[PDB]
Amino acid sequence: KVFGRCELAAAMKRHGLDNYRGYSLGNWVCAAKFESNFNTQATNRNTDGSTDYGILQINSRWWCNDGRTPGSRNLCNIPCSALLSSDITASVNCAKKIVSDGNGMNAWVAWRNRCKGTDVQAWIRGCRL
């Protein structure tokens, strides 16, 4: 599923991500924009053999099981395929674990490089939320 901008903002809010760990909804929408262009089915292979899955491109090294990432963990206790669903519940619940892990949203390199410090409220501007 390819979410609309405001549509994803609303779904994220619905699942309690707005201001989770102090990160405003715009931060999450921004991260999702540059990680997946709002596409739940986005996947990308990393040089190290792990794979990133879903709207927030959650990585199989630590967070989900895809059966093909040697030495990895599955700390969200989910198959990585669950992160590709049209229903964003699994991605949101797993992202809550990730952003609580110590470095906040810097865990998402694209958030640090393209969202951090910018006018992230622009991403939810105009949205009925």
Which residue in 84, 95, 76 sits closest to 15, CA to CA?
Answer: 95
Binding site as annotated, residues: 101
- Per the structure, the complete domain to which residue 127 belongs is given by 1-129
Does 35 qualify as catalytic in the annotation? Answer: yes
Residue 23, classed as helix, strand or coil, is: strand
Residue of 18, 52, 66, 87 marked catalytic: 52
- CA 122/CA 26 separation, integer angstroms: 7
Whether 62 and 51 have beta carbons less than 8 Å apart is answered as no
CA distance 125 to 129: 10
Q: Is 7 among the catalytic positions? A: no
Distances in Å between the Cα of 26 and the Cα atoms of 72, 77, 115, 120, 129 are 31, 27, 9, 5, 12
**Cβ–Cβ under 8 Å, residues 40 and 85:** yes
Break positions in the chain: residue before each gap, C to N over 2.5 angstroms: none
List, as residue ranges, the binding site for substrate.
Answer: 101
Determine which one of 18, 35, 66, 119 is catalytic.
35
Domain count, the chain: 1
First to last CA, the chain: 20
> Which CATH number is 21's domain given?
1.10.530.10
| Contact criterion met (CB below 8 Å) for 52 and 66 | no
